Design a protein around this motif. Sequence first.
Motif, short mmCIF file in Angstrom:
data_model
loop_
_atom_site.label_atom_id
_atom_site.label_comp_id
_atom_site.label_asym_id
_atom_site.label_seq_id
_atom_site.Cartn_x
_atom_site.Cartn_y
_atom_site.Cartn_z
N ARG A 176 19.71 62.55 50.12
CA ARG A 176 19.65 63.38 51.32
C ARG A 176 19.40 62.53 52.55
N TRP A 177 18.59 61.48 52.39
CA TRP A 177 18.11 60.70 53.50
C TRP A 177 19.25 59.95 54.18
N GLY A 178 19.31 60.10 55.49
CA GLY A 178 20.39 59.50 56.26
C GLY A 178 20.38 57.96 56.28
N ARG A 179 19.26 57.31 55.95
CA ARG A 179 19.19 55.85 55.95
C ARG A 179 19.53 55.26 54.58
N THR A 180 20.00 56.08 53.62
CA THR A 180 20.39 55.56 52.31
C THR A 180 21.32 54.35 52.45
N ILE B 33 34.68 57.18 51.89
CA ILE B 33 34.15 56.23 52.84
C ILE B 33 32.89 56.85 53.41
N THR B 34 31.75 56.53 52.78
CA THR B 34 30.51 57.25 53.00
C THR B 34 29.33 56.28 52.98
N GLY B 35 28.21 56.80 53.48
CA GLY B 35 26.95 56.04 53.52
C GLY B 35 25.97 56.48 52.44
N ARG B 36 26.21 57.62 51.80
CA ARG B 36 25.34 58.17 50.78
C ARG B 36 26.17 58.69 49.61
#
Lengths: 739, 772, 390
Positions: B161-165, B541-544
């Motif tokens: 959930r955390w945006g800084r993952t 193409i994702t951050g989490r």
Amino acid sequence: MELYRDPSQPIEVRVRDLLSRMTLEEKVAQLGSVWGYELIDERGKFSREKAKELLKNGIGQITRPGGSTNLEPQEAAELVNEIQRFLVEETRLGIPAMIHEECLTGYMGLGGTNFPQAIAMASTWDPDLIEKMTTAVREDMRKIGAHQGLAPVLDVARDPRWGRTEETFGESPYLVARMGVSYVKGLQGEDIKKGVVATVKHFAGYSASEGGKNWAPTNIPEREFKEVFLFPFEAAVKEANVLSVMNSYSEIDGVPCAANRKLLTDILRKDWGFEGIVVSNYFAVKVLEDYHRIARDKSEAARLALEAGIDVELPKTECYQYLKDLVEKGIISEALIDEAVTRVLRLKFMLGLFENPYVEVEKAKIESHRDIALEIARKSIILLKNDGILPLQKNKKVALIGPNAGEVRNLLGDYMYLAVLDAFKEEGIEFEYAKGCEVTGEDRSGFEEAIEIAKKSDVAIVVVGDKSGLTLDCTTGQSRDMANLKLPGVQEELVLEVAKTGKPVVLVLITGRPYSLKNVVDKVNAILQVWLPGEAGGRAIVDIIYGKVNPSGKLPISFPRSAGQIPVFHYVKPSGGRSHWHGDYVDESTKPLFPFGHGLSYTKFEYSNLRIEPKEVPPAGEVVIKVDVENIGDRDGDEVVQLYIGREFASVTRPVKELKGFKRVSLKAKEKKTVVFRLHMDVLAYYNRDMKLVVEPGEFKVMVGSSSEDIRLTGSFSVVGEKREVVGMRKFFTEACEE
Amino acid sequence: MELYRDPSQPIEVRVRDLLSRMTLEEKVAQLGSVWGYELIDERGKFSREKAKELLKNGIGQITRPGGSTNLEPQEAAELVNEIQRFLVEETRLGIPAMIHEECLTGYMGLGGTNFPQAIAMASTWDPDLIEKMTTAVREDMRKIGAHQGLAPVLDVARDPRWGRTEETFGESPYLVARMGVSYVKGLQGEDIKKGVVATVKHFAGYSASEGGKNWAPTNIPEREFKEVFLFPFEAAVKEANVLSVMNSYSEIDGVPCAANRKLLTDILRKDWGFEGIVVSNYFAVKVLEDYHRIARDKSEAARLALEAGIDVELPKTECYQYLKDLVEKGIISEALIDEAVTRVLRLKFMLGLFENPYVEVEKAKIESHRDIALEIARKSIILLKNDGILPLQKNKKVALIGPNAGEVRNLLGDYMYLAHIRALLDNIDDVFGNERLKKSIEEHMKSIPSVLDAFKEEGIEFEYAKGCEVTGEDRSGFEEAIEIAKKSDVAIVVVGDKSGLTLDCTTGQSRDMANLKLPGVQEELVLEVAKTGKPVVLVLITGRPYSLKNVVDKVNAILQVWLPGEAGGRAIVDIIYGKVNPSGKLPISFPRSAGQIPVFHYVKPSGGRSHWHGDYVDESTKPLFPFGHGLSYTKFEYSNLRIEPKEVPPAGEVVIKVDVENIGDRDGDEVVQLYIGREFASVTRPVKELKGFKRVSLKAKEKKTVVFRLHMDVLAYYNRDMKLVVEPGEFKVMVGSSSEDIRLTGSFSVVGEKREVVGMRKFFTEACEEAA
Amino acid sequence: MELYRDPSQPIEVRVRDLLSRMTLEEKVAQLGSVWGYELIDERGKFSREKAKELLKNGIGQITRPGGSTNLEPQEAAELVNEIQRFLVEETRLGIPAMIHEECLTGYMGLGGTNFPQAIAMASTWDPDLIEKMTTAVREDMRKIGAHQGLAPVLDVARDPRWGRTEETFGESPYLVARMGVSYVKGLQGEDIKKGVVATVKHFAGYSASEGGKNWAPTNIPEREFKEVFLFPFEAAVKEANVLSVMNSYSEIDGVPCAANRKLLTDILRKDWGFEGIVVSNYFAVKVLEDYHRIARDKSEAARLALEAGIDVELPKTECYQYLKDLVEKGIISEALIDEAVTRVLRLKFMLGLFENPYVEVEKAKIESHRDIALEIARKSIILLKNDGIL
Ligand SMILES: O[C@@H]1[C@@H](O)[C@H](O[C@@H]2CO[C@@H](O[C@@H]3CO[C@@H](O[C@@H]4CO[C@@H](O)[C@H](O)[C@H]4O)[C@H](O)[C@H]3O)[C@H](O)[C@H]2O)OC[C@H]1O
Ligand SMILES: O[C@@H]1[C@@H](O)[C@H](O[C@@H]2CO[C@@H](O[C@@H]3CO[C@@H](O[C@@H]4CO[C@@H](O)[C@H](O)[C@H]4O)[C@H](O)[C@H]3O)[C@H](O)[C@H]2O)OC[C@H]1O
Ligand SMILES: O[C@@H]1[C@@H](O)[C@H](O[C@@H]2CO[C@@H](O[C@@H]3CO[C@@H](O)[C@H](O)[C@H]3O)[C@H](O)[C@H]2O)OC[C@H]1O
């Protein structure tokens, strides 16, 4: 006669005498148990043949002589008398057994009333009513010769995924603690020889498992542990003198609770002064080996549990027989066995069992408490939403739809022994019924019929929710954890299909947990939360729908918008309950859909004239908070007035608001009363950076309202003087009254 | 000359001499900072007028002279030289500044290469490659006169959930620690006078906030805290000699980390021997008042932070100026200021700043490291699923669909300069009361190679349809996408995040995602395309991690492309067509759904399941893709497990060898993973936990031996009394291609008395290759 | 050249490089010692034959090359130079030795001034005079190639039964601490490459033995321990930057100080930030076995002392040779040896020994400091009673 047999001697003298006479085998026997069903023949009669093997050297407890045999009350009483006579007359020392049953929602055996679930009890916000309930349960249990009830659950629940949410009193340490003390007090009474031992469970942290999963780790740091999870048990121990505790199955941070002496002894016994017995959670000793993998064999499991402070292994001797071997082999000291046996014997003396272990079978017929059950059901239902559709007029044609509308089994909770359309019929309503769908599965073949009866009606009443129990077909209850918080099966889809007809919709949730209502809330006209109501359920629902009863329940647990929002709770720190710095998630509010303490009425209450006196108090002083509440609507009703306290600029962070008092108040239309809260500073104590319990000088905010969000009046007072370390006994609760 | 000016004197002598000469005001000034942008005029040139006010008594640090000014490298170097000349020549004592920048994914300023995100770095399982990366970053930063980079992030992430993952190295304390040590080593080098100070953050627990919400409480009990969250920082301090630490914004169990002396001093300095500087998280001192509500004013905030062990207030002096007042009013001792100032001056001497604080502007042109970025991107992409569709044949007509196929901006992560700077653009645009910048952003953005460009360069015949935006509910682009899919041989659907700090972003700092659904109507786009019956390659193409439960069985292959920066397009197309054999492995578990959170490979026996039915009512308890998961276009066969010796004493060493053969038809890298399990300890232990790994290159039909040297120190855990121990008993050895795809198992025993592990101890397994 | 040999590199770089090159045997050798008298022939000259056995893999320290040999200063300097040349030129890595001597009342060897005892020093109440004294002692010691003096005694004395009372600065934690700081400052100076390492002793509590009896238990509760006994050492560490500490022979409340990690590591290193070396009291490691009876053999004694935080076994290697065996047998981690060796090598670099371990013998003539001794004697004598006769 021997001193232990002489009732003129103090219990301590009798205990010491008895212990001095016992063999090691007899000692170890007092730390174990046998199931009721192991002591009967195929007709449910006591079997001397079986008793000769299992009771030869005495026994600590009999597990569920009523609950595990399916005997009616008089037959259970006869069984228990025959067990006791065998122990008294055909063992060397004649030590009687303690009997335990489940009793959370009433004695869990044939013939006993099935009261509403615990989360319903909490939703009443009526501690005296719960005390009345367990006073009744006390008399039911004593009729069959049962001495101990395995209740209440004081697990504080902030994770509604967990299947045992229904067995809790919700998210608030304050409300859980206060309901717990009333519960205990009713069961035990003043002299336990005339009462029933309560068992607070599951010590401690058990409602905070990883991912909401049953038995998974409960990894809670120290201040949170003390302030949230331990606090209700602390109050039960110190204020209610609770005489039994049962442990959590989970590990806390690598240490299984059944093997944790720091928890079961150092906190419970040494710090808090608990003097009763710790009974194992069922099989909790053995699963130190089988599940947690920290004991290599049953002997090691026994040693770990005894050292931790478990006195009685339930539900049957399994590992604790090896305590004999451990002493004989010089691995543990017999003194440690003596310590446990002493606790068990003392309580047996206190229960009067050495003077009279028998009951009159002719009196063992348990009375119905449907009256008390109905009062709880009527006060527990929560009106979550109402655009004005409710109450309904009796002349409206109803389409009664959904799996929980017709299904009596699904009104029951997971510790009701036996685990609505009738009520509509009795009230004289004109309606058609369509099941619509099952609780589980994907079958939509019943939708068309439900839609068609909706189209022909004035209002659709859609009754959905859970089936509670321990098996795979159940959607809530012990072992049935729900990850994503969607109503089970295609019930949500049913509600939305009915709403699409354009007819008014009343949604009735008959459930054990909060569900996500985000996709239905704005599509229906009213919502009633009916926590699993047991045998009183139908009547109360219809009473409320038609306004014969004005709903007055308040949420004891926050309703999340979605599972991904978990946890949501009212007493967040300033950094809790939000994402910094945009406030919300990308995809979701951080606020719950319905907050703690939420519950509407068919009337309106107006709060005025907040008084807080004095405005400055020293760190062990008392403030008196008064508000006036007036029913300014057109229907009589009960309001639950709620007191929240906030603190900033302590040496640690504190909740922005946290429940510290409450009162259910009855108001006729146009009646005004004064509600008074007496708040001792002891009640506000919190743990500082050094883990000391303190009251620090500074300002406390007072917030009085109709829910944790619907705050009506605010003000503040100050604590003035040097920081106080709160030592020894202290007050736990505010006192509330009306003027 | 004064001793402090004399380079023949030991640093300790120079420090003591300097401190003895300083006024209280000058001391307090060394504990603060000024923004780069506060020291420039409208033409981006140093302003002596502004410096006279802000630097008159010296300064601790300059915050982001490149990152906050939008200056090109030679202009940023000029600025920094002019700042240093002012400090050296126009203050009484001539103490130079330390300069810091962001550098997680490369120097965060114009002209710096945009490397793949940290979670991509971890997905390589290639520590040496990351050390090569930060060695390059070191040289970039030194060119502009920057001394400290605010990286790496050692927060261990089990809550996607955390945006800084995307900024983390994933869920495994082992992998995070090992990648962190390499990261630090590359930035700092051996002699810090020739390197850049690394800054491990955010100490500690910051990735475990309530509900995955940014800045919310991180309520972690002690053994978990030590074993999971502290461990990577411990390794960074003790093995990598990291010279800075930055604190967490969160409270742990009622105590804000910025006010916690038990954490920032007793653990970090006393227990572990950290000798560098603690720099505040930005504004962390002030928000002891404003956010946590435990300080009544700025003075009290300053006192709490200084007592806790924060040496430098960033990004600008705000509360720490009141340390002067606190001493003058007899509220705190000047000795406590002296302790902090000492740490700062020592590091400034060690950086060589008193001998030479200047750089050659003619050399300040930062070189491209696209080569290193491409190696990372190529090794980081993970093949999550492949039914055989990949690699694609080049003759197949492609329908290229989705917002992340067509937008270069969405390749960028939250600490890549052209993404991060959008927040500043917003704040300027929000001014309703009393240009060249928006143009330089757009022109630099235009320079970044696109996914579209990559398909074109590879010579693929394709049509492109956007399909939908990253956010919102607009489905009016679906029809076009569906139509081009129907006319194609294969649909390549490229979906995912826009990462950054603003509301239009879906991941990144401050953008937390509760329900883990692909943003907007992107999931619906995938499903609509799939309904055509055409083969679908899904490119994330994702951050989490996102929940893929609703699409996984509806698509033919899935590639996870953690925000890849400028090398992204080429690497994706290389992999799709088999020019590169995918070799990335998940450094974080992919949940089936948000309600399953958390899922992680190193659960205790009671973790990762619901007793006694195993699953939830509505959901498996297993993650959809486990830690260490990653497929290949070839197959690897593991054989010949050897474990010697079979019995080892509590401070001994075991040697684990396996043979791995590439039995397929394409060259490829495998990441061989070592898991250890333990039961019948005195506390519960993970059923399996990562303890070693090796990326191994294998030609088709090549076989090599992989060797793990495992010292018992590496297995130490905390017992019931919070002692670090190795206990006699049996350890299970599990070697395989993921945490689930275990190929070979065996065991060894520790024999002898329980051992308390005291003092220095080994943290890592050593891994190498031998000839089979 | 190898990084460790390069004086342009920071010491931390040189230390790490050197450690990375060392065998286990060479590491363990840095944690031990040899007596001066074991390295001389019958004519008081360096013996290469004896050195080949005792120094073959290097050494931590030479114990009392002047004090144990009865050599005059120029002969002691010659001995020390010959020892260092053997280490520098005839061992694999060429690590020089640290030399220690007693110096409480001046360098304890032929040719050194005999200053008044420590209790006389304290009786002056003149810290600057004591700093002047140890500045002179510093120059005496450096002339003969000595790097460390085993002084001062910071034991706080309230029991005059004890025979070591004369070595203390008396009963007052304040006065003891203040005199100790001046003492240390004079010996060490600003840059230790030009000074002598001071060694505060005997950490801690050693002046409070049961009945005033030497080596008997020092059973001191915690606040008293901190405020009275630890305080002077705390000041020496934090204000005077003292670079060595020596432990007490006694137990505190059941725990021998030489085996107490809580004392020699957690207080001294973790809480107070001490960065130098802990040197054993003489034979203190072995007597964990022989006297206190808590170690069953020399290996166990070594392990307890190393875990506690003793870096160098004095006055001769006896138990610490078994640290090699303990690592090889997987009983202790080599990382724990590395931690100790690091401390020793760092101090050797800081003393300049890798740049120049030699002294000029023609300058090794120690000067008389009778003048300073007389000032101390004149200020130290106390008039306890005088009816007018004096
Ligand atoms: O849209 C506007 C909002 O942005 C604004 O709210 C403020 C937004 O900025 C917030 O401060 C942030 C806090 O986090 C910092 O990040 C750290 C920086 O250093 C890194 O190395 C470290 O890893 C990070 O954790 C960031 O620098 C800083 O800008 C502030 O708290 C908000 O209140 O309000 C006005 C709106 O118009
Ligand atoms: O008469 C003979 C006896 O002497 C002998 O017994 C041994 C005598 O010596 C004892 O060892 C002592 C222990 O104390 C040491 O002092 C320390 C040295 O370094 C200083 O810096 C520190 O301040 C001191 O505390 C001393 O060096 C050493 O010689 C030994 O324990 C006795 O057993 O037995 C034989 C008799 O004939
Ligand atoms: O509140 C108490 C409960 O916690 C307790 O419940 C027991 C939970 O374990 C059950 O055993 C499982 C049954 O199904 C098998 O497949 C599993 O392997 C078993 O572990 C047991 O039946 C329950 O009694 O009961 C006592 C309550 O007071």
